[PDB]
Every structure is written in structure tokens, then in C-alpha cells.
Amino acid sequence: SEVAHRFKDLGEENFKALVLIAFAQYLQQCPFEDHVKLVNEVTEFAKTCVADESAENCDKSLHTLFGDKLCTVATLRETYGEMADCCAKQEPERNECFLQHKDDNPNLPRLVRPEVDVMCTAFHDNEETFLKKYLYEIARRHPYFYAPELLFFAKRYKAAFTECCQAADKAACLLPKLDELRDEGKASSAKQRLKCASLQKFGERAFKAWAVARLSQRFPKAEFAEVSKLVTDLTKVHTECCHGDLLECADDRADLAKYICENQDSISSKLKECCEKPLLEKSHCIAEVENDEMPADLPSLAADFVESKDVCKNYAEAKDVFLGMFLYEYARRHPDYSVVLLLRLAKTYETTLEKCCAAADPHECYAKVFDEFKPLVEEPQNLIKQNCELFEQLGEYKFQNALLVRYTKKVPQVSTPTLVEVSRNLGKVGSKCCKHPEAKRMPCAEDYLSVVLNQLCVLHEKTPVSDRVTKCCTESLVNRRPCFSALEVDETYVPKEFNAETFTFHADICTLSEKERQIKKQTALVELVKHKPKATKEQLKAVMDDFAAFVEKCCKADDKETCFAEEGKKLVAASQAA
Numbered sequence: 001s002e003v004a005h006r007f008k009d010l011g012e013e014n015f016k017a018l019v020l021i022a023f024a025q026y027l028q029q030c031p032f033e034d035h036v037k038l039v040n041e042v043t044e045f046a047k048t049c050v051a052d053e054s055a056e057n058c059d060k061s062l063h064t065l066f067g068d069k070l071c072t073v074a075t076l077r078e079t080y081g082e083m084a085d086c087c088a089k090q091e092p093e094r095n096e097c098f099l100q101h102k103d104d105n106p107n108l109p110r111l112v113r114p115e116v117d118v119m120c121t122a123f124h125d126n127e128e129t130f131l132k133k134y135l136y137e138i139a140r141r142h143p144y145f146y147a148p149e150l151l152f153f154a155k156r157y158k159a160a161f162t163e164c165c166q167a168a169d170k171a172a173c174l175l176p177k178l179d180e181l182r183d184e185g186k187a188s189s190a191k192q193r194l195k196c197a198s199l200q201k202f203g204e205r206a207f208k209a210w211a212v213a214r215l216s217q218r219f220p221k222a223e224f225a226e227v228s229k230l231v232t233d234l235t236k237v238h239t240e241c242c243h244g245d246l247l248e249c250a251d252d253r254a255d256l257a258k259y260i261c262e263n264q265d266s267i268s269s270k271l272k273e274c275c276e277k278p279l280l281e282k283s284h285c286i287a288e289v290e291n292d293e294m295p296a297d298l299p300s301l302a303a304d305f306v307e308s309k310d311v312c313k314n315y316a317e318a319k320d321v322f323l324g325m326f327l328y329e330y331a332r333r334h335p336d337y338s339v340v341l342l343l344r345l346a347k348t349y350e351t352t353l354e355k356c357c358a359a360a361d362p363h364e365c366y367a368k369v370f371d372e373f374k375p376l377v378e379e380p381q382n383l384i385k386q387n388c389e390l391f392e393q394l395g396e397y398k399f400q401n402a403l404l405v406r407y408t409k410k411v412p413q414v415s416t417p418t419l420v421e422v423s424r425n426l427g428k429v430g431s432k433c434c435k436h437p438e439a440k441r442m443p444c445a446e447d448y449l450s451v452v453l454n455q456l457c458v459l460h461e462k463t464p465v466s467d468r469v470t471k472c473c474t475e476s477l478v479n480r481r482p483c484f485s486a487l488e489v490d491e492t493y494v495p496k497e498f499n500a501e502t503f504t505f506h507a508d509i510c511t512l513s514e515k516e517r518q519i520k521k522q523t524a525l526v527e528l529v530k531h532k533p534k535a536t537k538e539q540l541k542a543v544m545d546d547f548a549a550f551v552e553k554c555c556k557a558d559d560k561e562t563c564f565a566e567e568g569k570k571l572v573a574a575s576q577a578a
């Protein structure tokens, strides 16, 4: 028995929670009730396997059990049409079918939230179904959410109500903590979506490279042999969580924290405080610890990597280990570099050793390698420096609007909603990183753009409309940013054509929050740039200036929200003029 295994390790709480998340992430459109049912039928079975370890099918692989359970509702194609197919499949992958069918953008209605007076009551009456509903909603809207981390977000979500419901001003104590969590959750989710895309679309060697750089940056004092161990394990953990195997991922993840904390003196000195607490908190801590201080007297890289005469020979012996050692050695002394830049230098070095080593005189050919690193390193520095300056003058909103115009011109085929969402997130880097010392600016900015751009890539892969996006997304994981910065204005795009249904105006806008108001304005700008790419400099503003006027007036005029229809057609006349 395996299901027996995981049960004993995670116990009832966690085991039950993880299974729900797994089920919710597979059948995102399936109602809460049904999921709870299967989860229970599923948990009950488990309990018997514990006692009798060969009873029904207790001898099974979680994949058959889980699969069959879901298939008791999936065969209902009138609800989940294309799902029934996966069910008719077999063992080798009646699952590859499921994972392949995950929606990164489910057509699930907005999740609005009941007055502080209800959530509190509902929470107190039944604390179980309240928290269960949380995970269900998150996991079903974020099919790649790092499961073990979702359990941590849950323990915090509970503590939010556990406390604020006992306030004097609940709405005051809650609202905050609830926002803060909604944001941090969308981040953790994007951070993880990139980790799964790497493994799934580029391979484990790719993820392994990213881990070596990252870990070496964080734990400079750690030895190469140690980092590899860590990289090996961490890779397996994420491979499982991304293959849909959450129970083993959670288990293995706990084992790693245990290890890392045990060999504390051998890895980092800033681990102490993470090793002193509740596991879930210990795991989230280690994963977010600050880099350790850099080892005092460190030799120069040129020594064993460009000046040694045995370079080519060692490369031939164990290239992967050699290049791994290079990356580890370069990253440990450069916490001021982003992880993609470090991977760019490593790829440039390998490429050089390849052509150089088959030469009539290596050491002569590869002897000036660091000369090619210069441009690679300066490029992001200049980009960061310049976009931060600009972001400072215009602020976040105006900056976002700049990227919006820019990016819609780059790839006009992309759907407006994605452009708006992506441009917004790109602008949010300014507030997030610009306020940092140049020593921490690049790692902050560039790696965050690797997450934001990945989101655009996974969202585009759904319905590919621009081969330029496909190319930049597929050609290189590490050069995605550089690829997109290089893109200019699509000279082959043909302007859209106005039609009524293009943009709808109903008064319903005057009720929405300040945010959804800007958003509707940004959605307008994108639609504008799609209809008038070229002609655009400052007619854009002049017009956007006009759109604001429209809303202001019509929302505060007291006619039926009629002017909306009349004046709606009025502005269109003006717009076209420009």
C-alpha cells in the first residue's frame, strides 16, 4: 500500500487537504459538494488500507485510484465534455490526458466576497467547510499552485478570521490581511507556474541549471557537492508537484527542510531562525531566506576556467559537472546578477568551449572569453537603469500605460485582456524593484520579468495568434526577455475595424471600484492602439483625455444612463477624426 504510506506521513488534516487540492486542480469546473464527497469516499478507503494493507485495491498507485474516482463524474461530458475521453484511456497516461487538460484561465465567475459580517459567522459556525471552500476556490483557479505552500496560505487565512472576527472593527482588522494574502498568493502562483513550464517545456536539465545558480547565490559558503545534492532533491520535489503527484511532493518537501536544517552549518548561517519553527512555516522560511555572506578570500574565476591549460580536457571528461562547477563558482560571487544573466554567461561559456576546444590551439581561442561577457552583463543594467528613471517620473499608472502602447505595437494579435494584464504586471516591477540599490536591482527586476513574461507565454500558447510571441517563448527560456525587448512594431499587422460590439458602454461602470475603472480605461487604450497603430503620438492622450471626460459626465449627469448611448456614439465620431 502507498495511499497508506502518504496517510501516515501527512496525517489526516494534510492528507485530506492535499487530496482536495489535487481533485480541484484536475476538475476545476466541478462543484464543491461533489469534490468533498469523493475526497471523503477517498479518505475512508485510505483508513482501511492502513489497518489491512491489501484489502480492496489498497495495493494501488494513487494514479489509478484517484483517476477512477474522478471518472465517476467526468464521464458526464454534458458538464465536462472533452473529459470523458481521458476516462476511456488507460494506465500509462489516462493521466497525461488530465494534466494536459488543465486550464490556466478557467471560465469561472469572479469570486466576490460577502460582508465581514457573513464570512465571520460562516467561519465560526463551521470552521471546516469554511477553510475547505478556500482551498477549493484557489486550487481550482490556480491549477499549478505550489500545493504544500497552499496549506501554509490556509493556516494564515484561518488565523486572519480567527483574530479579526474578535476585533472591535472586524472589517478593519480583516480587509487588510485578506488583501495582502490575495496578492502574495497570485505571486507564489506565478513563481511556480514558471518552475513547471521549465521542467515541462524545456526539460529537467534546464530547471537543474536554474536551481544551481539560485542556490549558489543564496548559499555561497556551501560546497559544490552539497549544492548538487540540494539541486537533485529540489528538482524531484517540483517534478512531482508539477506531474500532479501532490502527496509525495509534500512529503519530499518536508524531508528536504529536515535535511537542510540538520546540516545547517554546512549550508547557510541565516537558516537558524527558520529551523526553529512549525514545519509549514519552516519550509516557507527556507525557501525565502536571504543569501548568506560571501566567503572572504576567494580566488579568481580566470584561474581554473580560462587560464588553466587543462580546461578543454576537464570539459571533455565531465562537461556537465564542469559547466555546473563554473555556474556555481560564478553565481556564488555574484548575488548582484539575475539568475537568467548567470545562465546566459554559462551558455556563452559552453558555446565557446565547444568551438574553441576543437581548435588548433585552445587556450588561444578561449583565452578572451570574459570579453564577451561584458556586453551580456551591461545590457540588463542599462535597461534597468533607464526604465527605472522613466517609471520615477510618470509613476506606476502612467508607466503601465507606456508599456501598454509599446507592447500592443509589438504583438497586436494578442488578446486585449492578456495585453492589459501583462502590461500591468510589467509596470508593477517599477514599484517593486526600482527603489533598490543597484546591487539588488537586476536580480529583482530581470527575474520578476521572467515570471511575468512566462505568464504571457502560457496564456498565449492556449490560442496562438502571433508567431513572434511563439518564437520568443519557444526559442530560449533564458533569452525570453532579450527576445521581447528586441521586438519593435509589427510591420505586418493590419488594423482592426470598428464595429459596435468592439467596445460596449453601459452605465454599469460607475459602480465599480477605482481599480476596475483604470482597467476599463487601459482596455480602451489597447483597443485604440489596435485600430490605429501607426498614427499615434499624442492623439492617443488627447483621446484618452476625452474618454475620461465621457465617464465623469455621464456618471454624474442625471439622465437615465442614456447620454451613455448618445454621447457614446458622440465620442466615436471625435475619435475617428483623430
Ligand SMILES: CC(C)c1cccc(C(C)C)c1O
Binding pocket: 383, 384, 387, 388, 391, 403, 426, 427, 429, 430, 433, 434, 445, 449, 485
Ligand atoms: C524594473 C522595471 C521598471 C523594468 C526594468 C527593465 C525593463 C522593463 C520592461 C519595460 C521590459 C521593466 O518593467
Ligand SMILES: CC(C)c1cccc(C(C)C)c1O
Binding pocket: 498, 503, 524, 525, 527, 528, 531, 532, 543, 544, 547, 571, 572, 575, 576
Ligand atoms: C474608447 C475609444 C478610445 C476607442 C476604442 C477603440 C476604437 C476607437 C475608434 C477608432 C473607433 C475608439 O475611439
